[PDB]
Every structure is written in C-alpha cells, then in structure tokens.
Design a protein that fits this description.
The PDB classes it as hydrolase. Keywords: Ester synthetase, carboxylesterase, small molecule fatty acid esterase, hydrolase. It forms a dimeric assembly. The crystal structure of alpha/beta fold hydrolase. 2 copies of one chain form a homodimer. The two termini of chain A are about 15 Å apart. In chain A, helix 4 links the parallel strand 3 and strand 4. In chain A, strands 2-1-3-4-7-8 form a 6-stranded parallel beta sheet, with helices on both faces. Chain A has a two-stranded antiparallel ribbon with strand order 5-6. The first copy, chain A, has 11 helices and 8 strands. Chain A is an alpha/beta fold. The first copy, chain A, is about 40% helix and about 15% strand. Chain A has a single domain, classed as 3-Layer(aba) Sandwich (Rossmann fold), CATH 3.40.50. The interface between A and B is large, with 36 and 38 residues.
Chain lengths: ~280, ~280
C-alpha cells in the first residue's frame, strides 16, 4: 500500500480531501494532505475582505498579501510532503493534484521524480513543457469556463485572482456552486464555501514548467477526467492528455472517466477513493 | 510506532492540527485528524450568519441547524478514526483538545480495547456521571469565552462569530484562545472556524468506569495560560481522575501556552506527544 500525497487547488485547502482520505484510510491506505503556501492555515486576507457589506471597488484594487507566492513555493511544499510520505517506508508515493494543484505536482515531479511511483491529475492542469497554465485557461478548449463571472479583481492590479466565498449575494453564491460543485448537496457546498479563502496568487499561473520526458515523463501517469467539469472543461482535460501522449510516446496517460463536476471529493468521495485505489494497484 | 488520532474542540476542525501532524510525520509517526460531527466539512450555519452587518437579535434567536447533534454522534465518529488507525498495526494514542476531551472520554468508555494511551490537551476530562456543562465551576471563573457568547436556551447551540466585522470582538477572540499566536496565524485559523457548537453534548453525563476508561495509560497536557479551560479546572480534572482510579494516576505534562498550542508551539507539542507514545 503506497502512501498518497493529496494536493488541492485554488482557494481550497487540505480539508477538501477529508472524505476521500477517510475512505482511503478505511481501505488500508495512508494519505498526507497539506495546505499549499497562501492557502488554508497559510492564507492571508486583504483588509477589504473583512469590511462588510463588500466594497467591490476596494476589494478589486487592494494589492494581495499573497501576491509574492510562487510556483517554486508550491513545489517546495509538495516535495516536503512527498519526502515525509516516502520516509513512512511504504516505498514510492502516489502524488495526486486537483485543479491548480496539477501545476504544483508537475513542478515537484520534474524537480524530484525519484520518490514518486505514480502521478495523478484530477481535473487538473497537466501542462505541456514550457506552457504556462494561463495559456490553457484562455485556450479555445476552455471557452465557456464558468469562473470568469466570479472574478472580483483584475490580476494586473491585485497580483491575485479573487473570489468572494462570503458573498451575501444569492446570484453569486448560486454561480459558485454551479461552477465548482453542481452535483453537491447544498449543505456540503456551504460547508466548503466557509473554509475557502479569497486570494489565489496570480504568478504561479503565468509560470512555465520545464518538464522532460526522462524525468516527469517517465512517471506512471493517470488523469481522472471529470465529464461535467465547468471550470477546466472536458475538452481542455483531453488536450492535456493528448499533449502528454505525443510528448512521451512510450508512456501514454492512463485515463479514468468520472461522471462528475470539478469537485468529486464532495459529490462522490467514496467513488473517487475507489479510483485512487485502482490507480495504486495498477501495473506500470 | 503507534498511530495518533487527533480530536479537535468546539468551533474548530481537524485543520487545527496541521502543524502538529506534519511535525509528527517528520518524526515517523502517522496521525488521523478528522472533523467531529457538526464541525468542519460537517458544519451547518444559521441563515442569520450570512447577513453582514450581523443582526445580533436574529443570530441569538435562530434554532441551530446542528442542535440535534449528540455526544454519541461524536463518540461514534472518534471510534471510526480509532478503528481505522488501529488497522493502519496496533493500539492507538487517542488525543482530544478542549471539548474533544468529551468525545474521546465517551469513545474510550464505549470501546477502550484499541487505545494504548489517552491524552487530554487542555480538555474536558470529566468525572464519571458529571456532564461538561457542570464544569463550565469556581475553578473556571474569569473564563474569557463568556463575553464572546452570542446565543442563549432558544438556540440549542453555543454561538460565537469568528467572521465578526467588529475589531474589539475579534481582538477579544484572539486574547481568549490564541494570545500567543502571531496575528496572521490567528486570522487564518479564525477564517476556518464555525459559529454553532451543539449544546446537547455538554449536558450529557458520561458514565466512565475505572476498569475500562480508567484503566488506559492517561496523560493530561496542562496549558498554563489557558483563558478558556483555566489551569485550576484542568487540575480539578486530574485530581478527580486520580481519586476515581487509585493505582493508575494521571501523567501530567505542562506547556506554557494558551489554549491553542497547536499554533503557538506545535513542534514542542509534537515532542510531548512523541514522549507519551514512547512511555
């Protein structure tokens, strides 16, 4: 039983994996899930976020207190989690990234592939060598992405992409659920929205990752494609898969289809845990 | 190495143990930290909580959406974590903080077999038959929670407002639970906290018996600058357990910390937990 390292996405924290981790633990699998820099217990909030009712002008303009967080910072934290998971002595690890977390795990795996048995992209950025995540967000394959209407700051002004999980506007809160959690129970959504933060560093999205076939490319590679994802659309998920397949011909991606929104860790954590166990048992 | 099960207290979640778990993991110790019923990913909020500026009248009066949560619910959840930790290849170290001491007490009495060591960190360690609301005690006079309470009574929960827009309230909250924390650490923790803690579990007596619960190697980590469960009250628990179970006295450890050493001195706390695990 390899140990899983679970890496969350933008505005989220390790808490989003709570149900999945419990299901894995019951199935006999250990997991390490930690907050990325600038997220969770590491979050910082603009003063404008705590002055209510929200002044959209001020909240749009305020320089982010997490603007200087980098993709390298993300990679460093993930690599530390891989180290600890490896040191627990069950061999090489299964490294899982969701959404923006795919950028962090990609960077980590190229820098230090040795301790990683399998790398898993759950509805995540799995970018081509040298291509920043932002290029994908604006790609034709992602036309329709439902995050655009939730944006409350210009990244050129704020140094972050900003949302308001504490909005008192019914339309905004409905859109947040439709975009990230359409298949979730309303109460589950509200509990997640309570834990979300408002600022995600902009710079990591504009940072190319210099992957190579011999390092990142050599790792047994899985993509869990979420067929009703409204933010990283299925066509964009498939572009990532097709690019990796062309890049490393002798090590094609192992694809796992899930009929889910972007957030199966809330809507079907038991099923997601089952896919992860399948991956852990898979033969490379 | 035994696996630690870490149980949090009122209005908090498993996230509060993140630094401690990481410190344990670097030292080769596994930990399972999960949200109690009604907390974290399981929380529910009164509709009143979503209107800002807050309507204190409405927020005080609204029936809690977690009013139906019971001590047995807490215990059942802790036991599942103990069951998973035991499988993941021997008896566990069960650690409860603050109200979490009520859950681990109930869980140990109900099923003491898989627990090697039980650790109370600035936590309710109630005498048999005594409900936690009884201790809420002359030993606890000066408790800094009182002026932050925002419900009666009508609500079926004790209510605070970690999302308050009021600077004085937020400053009091930090003084009561996190005085020794850096400001930005406090703000990140306060963002994750919830507002309603079920009232009913506090009113529920746990019928502990010296032969099950009382028989487990028992540790109390006293927090010397705790402003919520005062040292005098910790010590009342320790004394009541020692009397109840001559022959298996409580092992006391002291941290010069506030109620929240998982933010102020996580590494030190991890070191105490590792020492307990090796005792």
């Amino acid at each position: 039983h390899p140990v899983f390292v679970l890496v969350h996405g933008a505005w989220h924290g390790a808490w989003c994996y709570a149900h999945v981790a419990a299901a894995l633990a019951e199935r006999g699998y250990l997991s390490i899930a930690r907050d990325l820099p600038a997220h969770g217990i590491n979050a910082r909030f603009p003063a404008s976020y705590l002055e209510r009712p929200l002044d959209k002008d001020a909240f749009g303009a305020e320089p982010s207190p997490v603007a200087n967080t980098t993709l390298d910072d993300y990679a460093t934290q993930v690599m530390e989690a891989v180290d600890d998971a490896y040191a627990l002595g069950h061999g090489k690890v299964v490294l899982v990234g969701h959404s923006m977390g795919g950028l962090a795990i990609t960077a980590a795996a190229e820098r230090a592939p040795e301790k990683i048995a399998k790398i898993v992209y759950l509805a995540a950025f799995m970018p081509a060598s040298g291509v920043p995540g932002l290029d994908y967000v604006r790609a034709p394959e992602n036309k329709g992405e439902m995050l655009a209407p939730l944006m409350l700051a210009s990244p050129r002004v704020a140094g972050a992409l900003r949302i308001d999980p504490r909005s008192g506007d019914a339309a905004y809160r409905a859109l947040a659920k439709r975009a990230l959690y359409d298949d979730a129970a309303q109460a589950d959504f509200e509990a997640m929205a309570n834990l979300m933060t408002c600022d995600v560093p902009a710079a990591p999205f504009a940072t190319a990752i210099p992957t190579t076939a011999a390092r990142w490319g050599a790792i047994d590679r899985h993509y869990i494609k979420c067929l009703a994802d409204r933010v990283i659309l299925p066509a964009l998920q498939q572009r990532f898969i097709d690019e990796a397949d062309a890049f490393v011909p002798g090590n094609p991606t192992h694809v796992h289809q899930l009929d889910s929104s972007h957030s199966p860790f809330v809507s079907q954590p038991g099923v997601l845990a089952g896919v992860l166990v399948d991956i852990a048992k898979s033969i490379a």
